């Protein structure tokens, strides 16, 4: 229960703001969009501020009309058909309230991914609900699809949004001058005890650990084990064990473990070297808006090296506003023009951004090397880069068997980018380098999920997780085996797993064989996709066992679980379940779909997919 800030409307009145942009974000994408819209206000004679709804009480929206030409914008992401954690309060409020929002003007931009049944559910709800409550829409709902290109969807919406705002309120495009949000303050003689060295919350919080641990106060768990899971050399799949003893962290199979990684030191050093900057300068970036709660873009004071290493994202392709602001620092005309045009909503500038930056997966260093005239000051770059996010992993262990250890099953990311270089996954490269052996510590925390084994030990379980999708099921199988050892009555436990070849990347091969031998796994159905000319996938095995699965589903009350790739595997497995139901019900495809979607609402078809 966070302590709410005082009314955001009064803050707007006291600081001359007429527009406030709220963000529902978990990976920081909606947060950036909000900040971008907020900063935009200035270019149209208005003044905005972005804000975390969790820190506020949206009921004060009814007071917003008290400000002339006032407006509120919501940039909301959706997660599993639900609101972001930080937007749950606001969501619950929209449902319970009956407050009259007459006079309130709003606009909504939703961040979603079409590869989901509930595409932009949050953005759609917020947009619809504010209207039901009496507020009037000032611009159409935005539907950003992260499966195509979200950045482009924002550009398009934004380009139309402002002219519509200006026309309704009768304001002009007062043109654009580079404006810093922070001021640099170099520190020449500061006590080392006050310089952030990578911690996420309070100073020295990593050195002096105190519970409870969470996203703002992660627990530095020792890496007790880090072994290679795959047999061959095509790729690198690994199994790590994080010791959470004395952390008091609670967890259950199905939960996720998040880790705060460190960027590649070489990459950090090269960025500093190409900019001719001294990365060991101790400094702070202080907000020019002395009223804002966001005093720095990241924990300060600190060195540029530490910022680029633990607080800043220096690997993902930079967004258009970043390249736009950096353009001023490119001394070669043609290069200044290419960067400037990256923010176009159409044409060659847009196409170049999509192919040369996004498709080629060029990170900031690559751009600095490919456009050699671009030499921005390090301090402004640090202000522009997005924050380094934590990465989530499906805990591969059962707390009933390993209450003081959190297991991770992950594939190391390393690929040839069309940018011509080899790109390395931040968290996995970092995880892979951690050696059991001070100790190898990993800053982490647990996030509870709704992916859970049936409450009743007798309820049948059908698990589908090819590749790394196996990771929560190792926890499930462990727990189910443990239940049998405790004398309990355990229903059928079926695993449908898949890999390329039994001698290449069959994860947990020995463990799964043991569980099967001992009866913990009623069936171990493995699809080896490359051992023959045609592909053999998990859904092929499900179709093969359609008769039995239907019996378990329709008569046994079986629970279905699907983990892994959400792009193709999940949809294909879902389609196969449609076919099974349709044939054995029997019923028309349309009803089969409803039947399966119903199982999802009744908690009997759960997902843990990602891209
Ligand atoms: C809820 C959830 C559960 C997850 N569970 C697990 C898990 O249990 N095990 C696991 O291994 N992962 C899991 N992940 C994925 C994990 O969170 C990270 O996204 C993954 O490990 C990569 O992170 P990274 O920092 O190593 O790579 P990053 O530096 O974050 O880079 C990731 C990006 O690289 C790009 N990329 C990757 N390959 C290519 C390529 N070949 N060509 C072009 N672009 C490419 C993509 O844009 C990808 O988004 C899960 C993710 C979520 C959201
Ligand atoms: O990511 P990761 O490394 O964890 O997984 P991954 O190794 O990329 O894939 C795991 C298994 O899933 C198979 N697969 C590929 N597409 C699938 C689909 N559309 N439906 C069902 N299975 C599919 C892969 O076969 P192929 O890689 O041979 O297609 C492989 O056998
Ligand atoms: C675990 C997970 C679940 C998601 N579930 C949904 C969903 O149900 N619907 C949707 O439209 N998008 C979904 N998305 C996509 C996000 O809404 C989209 O990537 C958004 O840009 C993230 O914004 P953020 O960085 O501000 O949190 C999901 C993404 C992840 C990683």
How does this model look, in words?
It is classed as oxidoreductase. Keywords: cytochrome P450 reductase, FMN binding, semiquinone, oxidoreductase. The assembly is monomeric. Rat CYPOR mutant - G141del/E142N. The protein is NADPH--cytochrome P450 reductase. The strands form five sheets. Strands 1, 2, 3, 4, 5, 6 and 7 form a seven-stranded mixed beta sheet that branches. The protein starts with 7 loop residues before the first helix and ends with a strand. Helix content is 32%, strand content 20%. The chain contains 19 helices and 23 strands. With 611 residues, it is of the alpha/beta class. The protein has four domains: 171 residues, 3-Layer(aba) Sandwich (Rossmann fold); 118 residues, Translation factors (Elongation Factor Tu (Ef-tu), domain 3), CATH 2.40.30; 126 residues, Up-down Bundle (NADPH-cytochrome p450 Reductase, Chain A, domain 3); 158 residues, 3-Layer(aba) Sandwich (Rossmann fold). Helix 16 packs parallel to helix 18 and helix 18 crosses helix 19. Helix 15 links the parallel strand 20 and strand 21. Bound molecules: flavin-adenine dinucleotide, NADP nicotinamide-adenine-dinucleotide phosphate and flavin mononucleotide. The site of flavin mononucleotide has 23 residues, from helix 2, strand 3 and strand 5.
Summarize the structure.
Its main location: endoplasmic reticulum. The chain has 611 residues and is of the alpha/beta class.
Fold topology:
Blueprint: H1 8-14, E1 19-24, H2 29-40, E2 48-51, E3 71-79, E4 82-83, H3 88-96, E5 105-112, H4 121-132, E6 136-137, E7 142-145, H5 150-169, E8 182-186, E9 219-228, E10 237-243, E11 256-259, H6 265-274, E12 282-287, E13 302-303, H7 304-311, H8 320-326, H9 333-340, H10 348-359, H11 364-370, H12 378-384, E14 391-394, E15 405-411, E16 414-416, E17 422-424, H13 426-433, E18 441-447, E19 461-464, H14 471-485, E20 493-499, H15 509-517, E21 523-528, H16 538-544, H17 546-555, E22 559-565, H18 569-584, H19 589-601, E23 605-610
Parallel strand pairs: 1-2, 1-3, 3-5, 5-6, 5-7, 19-20, 19-22, 20-21, 22-23
Antiparallel strand pairs: 3-4, 8-12, 9-10, 9-18, 10-15, 11-14, 11-18, 12-13, 16-17
The structure holds flavin-adenine dinucleotide (FAD), NADP nicotinamide-adenine-dinucleotide phosphate and flavin mononucleotide (FMN).
Flavin-adenine dinucleotide binds next to strand 14, strand 15 and helix 13.
């Amino acid at each position: 229960p966070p302590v709410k800030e005082s009314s955001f409307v009064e803050k707007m009145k006291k600081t001359g703001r007429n527009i406030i942009v709220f963000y529902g974000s978990q990976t920081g994408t909606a947060e950036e969009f909000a900040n971008r819209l907020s900063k935009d206000a200035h270019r149209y004679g208005m003044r905005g501020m972005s804000a975390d709804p969790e820190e506020y009480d949206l009921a004060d929206l009814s007071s917003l009309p008290e400000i002339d030409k006032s407006l509120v914008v919501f940039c909301m992401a959706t997660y599993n058909g639900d609101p972001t954690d930080n937007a749950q309060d606001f969501y619950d409020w929209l449902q319970e309230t009956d407050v009259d929002l007459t006079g309130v003007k709003f606009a909504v931009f939703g961040l979603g991914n079409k590869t989901y049944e509930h595409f932009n559910a949050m953005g759609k709800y917020v947009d619809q609900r504010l209207e039901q409550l009496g507020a009037q829409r000032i611009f159409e709902l935005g539907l950003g699809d992260d499966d195509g290109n979200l950045e482009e969807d924002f550009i398009t919406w934004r380009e139309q949004f402002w002219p519509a705002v200006c026309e309704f309120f009768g304001v002009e495009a007062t043109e654009e001058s580079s404006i810093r949000q922070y001021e640099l303050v170099v520190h020449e003689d500061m006590d080392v005890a006050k310089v952030y060295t990578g911690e996420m919350g309070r100073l020295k919080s990593y050195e002096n650990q105190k519970p409870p641990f969470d996203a703002k106060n992660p627990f530095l768990a020792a890496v007790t084990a880090n072994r290679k899971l795959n047999q061959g050399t095509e790729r690198h799949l690994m199994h790590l064990e994080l010791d959470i003893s004395d952390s008091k962290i609670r967890y259950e199979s199905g939960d996720h473990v998040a880790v705060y990684p460190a960027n590649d030191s070489a990459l950090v050093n090269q960025i500093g070297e190409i900019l001719g900057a001294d990365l060991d300068v101790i400094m702070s970036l202080n907000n020019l808006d002395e009223e804002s709660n966001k005093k720095h873009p990241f924990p300060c004071p600190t060195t540029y090296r530490t910022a680029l290493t633990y607080y800043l994202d220096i690997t993902n392709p930079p967004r258009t506003n970043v390249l736009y602001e950096l353009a001023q620092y490119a001394s070669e005309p043609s290069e200044q023009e290419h960067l400037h045009k990256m923010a176009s909503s159409s044409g060659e500038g847009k196409e170049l951004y999509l192919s040369w930056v996004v498709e080629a997966r060029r990170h900031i260093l690559a751009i600095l090397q490919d456009y050699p005239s671009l030499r921005p000051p390090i301090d402004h770059l640090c202000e522009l880069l997005p924050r380094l996010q934590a990465r989530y992993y499906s805990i591969a262990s059962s707390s009933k068997v390993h209450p003081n250890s959190v297991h991770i099953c992950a594939v190391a990311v390393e690929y040839e980018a069309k940018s011509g270089r080899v790109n390395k996954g931040v968290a996995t490269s970092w995880l892979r380098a951690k050696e059991p052996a001070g100790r190898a510590l990993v800053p982490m925390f647990v996030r509870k999920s709704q992916f859970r084994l049936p409450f009743k030990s007798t309820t049948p379980v059908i698990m589908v997780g090819p590749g790394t999708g196996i990771a929560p099921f190792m926890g499930f199988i462990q727990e189910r085996a443990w239940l049998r050892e405790q004398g309990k009555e355990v229903g059928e436990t079926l695993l449908y797993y898949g890999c390329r070849r039994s001698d290449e990347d069959y994860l947990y091969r020995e463990e799964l064989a043991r569980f099967h031998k001992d009866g913990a796994l009623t069936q171990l159905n493995v699809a080896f996709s490359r051992e023959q000319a045609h592909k053999v996938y998990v859904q092929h095995l499900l179709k093969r066992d359609r008769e039995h699965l239907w019996k378990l589903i329709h008569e046994g009350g079986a629970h279905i679980y699907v983990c892994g790739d959400a792009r193709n595997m999940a949809k294909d497995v879902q389609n196969t379940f449609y076919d099974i139901v349709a044939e054995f019900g029997p019923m028309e495809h349309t009803q089969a779909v409803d039947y399966v979607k119903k199982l999802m609402t009744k908690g009997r078809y759960s997902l843990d997919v990602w891209s």
